[PDB]
Design a protein around this nucleic acid. Structure first.
Lengths: 62, 93, 95
DNA sequence: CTCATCCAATCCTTTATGGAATCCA
DNA sequence: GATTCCATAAAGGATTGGATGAGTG
């Protein structure tokens, strides 16, 4: 029911096979985490922020 | 499985490039932000996959930058090839 | 000098490219891909940039027809179907 | 109503090295 | 010569959430 261009048709099928193999070893990305790193997540909770939530510049206000 | 940090290019890098092609005040969803980095990494595997597929035919074991250029011409990405060699050649020396 | 030193507007960003080390890792995600030239990640860093701009701009058109200001995932979905160059993304996108 | 923009400081990644083994025109 | 590994080092920029106005549904 779906149609694709001839320049990549067979190229897609070859890629299609490859991807199936990757799923056999569960090498594909299933779902996304809320944040990549716990350390960077924590650091972001310790930043000085303005009343509007934006990260604040340490240098200003003496 | 493998790590997200190894499968997709950084989303900050992607977001910056998408916004360069749009009007100044345009917004971009996080859903749209994330699927584009899925498309780009598949674009990498779709070109590299066939660049080596002809490297199978050619019985050559490393993948040259020019095999990628021919693979992009094969898959219909011929428009890119002309600026790419200009970019490529500066790096050559 | 003239009355004032004339000025130029800054819209440029520091020359940033996608990380080569990651590009190579994505390139090798395939079992048979085993050896890759030093500059094969170089050409993809530039090729991916050209790929972003085309796909984003084409999806943008779909958003303007819907009379919106934010690009969303469905827009990319139509840009994939509409253009035959983006046909390798059938299994990455909906529609 | 939901959500994407807006900041900047760490800290993981990237790049840069130096070697090791292996392969092949 | 390529390229791949494994280290060590430096350097750097991506990551990251609160508040709130833009804008979707």
């Amino acid at each position: 029911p779906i149609f694709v261009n001839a320049k990549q048709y067979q190229a897609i099928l070859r890629r299609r096979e490859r991807r199936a193999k990757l799923e056999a070893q569960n090498k594909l990305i299933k779902v996304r985490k809320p944040y990549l790193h716990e350390s960077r997540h924590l650091h972001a909770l310790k930043r000085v922020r303005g009343s509007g939530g934006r990260f604040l510049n340490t240098k200003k206000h003496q | 499985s493998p790590r997200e940090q190894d499968r997709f290019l950084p989303i900050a890098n992607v977001s910056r490039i998408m916004k360069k092609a749009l009007p100044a005040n345009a917004k971009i969803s996080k859903d749209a932000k994330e699927t584009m980095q899925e498309c780009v990494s598949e674009f990498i595997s779709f070109v590299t996959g066939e660049a080596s597929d002809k490297c199978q035919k050619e019985k050559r074991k490393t993948i040259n930058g020019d095999d990628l250029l021919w693979a992009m011409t094969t898959l219909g990405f011929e428009d890119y090839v002309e600026p790419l060699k200009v970019y490529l050649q500066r790096f050559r020396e | 000098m003239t009355q004032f030193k004339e000025i130029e507007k800054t819209t440029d960003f520091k020359n940033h490219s996608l990380p080569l080390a990651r590009i190579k890792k994505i390139m090798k995600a395939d079992e048979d891909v085993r050896m890759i030239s030093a500059e094969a990640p170089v050409v993809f860093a530039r090729a991916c940039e050209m790929f972003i701009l085309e796909l984003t701009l084409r999806s943008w058109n779909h958003t303007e027809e819907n009379k919106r200001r934010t690009l969303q995932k469905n827009d990319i979905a139509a840009a994939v179907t509409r253009t035959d160059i983006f046909d390798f993304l059938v299994d990455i996108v909906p529609r």
